Amino acid sequence: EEASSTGRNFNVEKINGEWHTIILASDKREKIEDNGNFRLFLEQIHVLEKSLVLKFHTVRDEECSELSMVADKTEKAGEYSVTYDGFNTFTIPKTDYDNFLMAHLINEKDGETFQLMGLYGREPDLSSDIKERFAQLCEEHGILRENIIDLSNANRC
Numbered sequence: 188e189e190a191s192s193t194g195r196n197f198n199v200e201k202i203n204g205e206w207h208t209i210i211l212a213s214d215k216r217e218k219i220e221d222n223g224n225f226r227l228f229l230e231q232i233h234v235l236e237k238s239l240v241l242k243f244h245t246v247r248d249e250e251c252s253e254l255s256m257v258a259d260k261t262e263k264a265g266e267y268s269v270t271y272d273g274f275n276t277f278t279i280p281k282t283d284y285d286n287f288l289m290a291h292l293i294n295e296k297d298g299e300t301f302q303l304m305g306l307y308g309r310e311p312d313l314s315s316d317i318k319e320r321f322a323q324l325c326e327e328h329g330i331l332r333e334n335i336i337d338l339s340n341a342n343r344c
């Protein structure tokens with residue numbers, strides 16, 4: 188079965204655990220390019236009662252750095268917020284819990300905004316079919332494929 192965090196049948200506990208960043212996308216491409224603050228490699232999601240603890244690592248000069256963040260539930264069901272290089276809110280428009288999770292995030296910094304979409308997998312990669320479904324979801328949000336970066340060959344330390 189598949190679900191959206193904003194949907195009636197969402198079971199947040201089912202997204203707990205191991206995850207890997209497979210693809211990142213953004214309408215401000217520089218944010219997820221090599222030196223971007225949003226080129227974040229997810230490692231795990233710890234589901235708590237009113238929040239999600241997100242464990243990531245960033246890479247620089249081929250060196251990994253750990254980063255942890257706490258995302259709080261907002262008043263919108265299925266939406267979480269987190270302070271990181273500005274103010275962020277995000278939802279999970281589609282996940283099947285066992286293979287993939289697709290997130291859509293809005294960042295606001297210095298009076299500006301941009302969209303970020305991420306495709307995470309339980310394993311370090313996903314099938315080409317799931318990657319295509321992600322490209323379609325990015326398209327629905329006005330993000331061109333040229334702004335979608337597959338990081339499956341660079342998500343391990």
Ligand SMILES: OCCCCCCCCO
Nearest residue numbers: 225226227277290292305
């Ligand atoms: O690409 C790093 C910016 C935050 C994305 C995290 C969203 C994952 C939702 O579990």
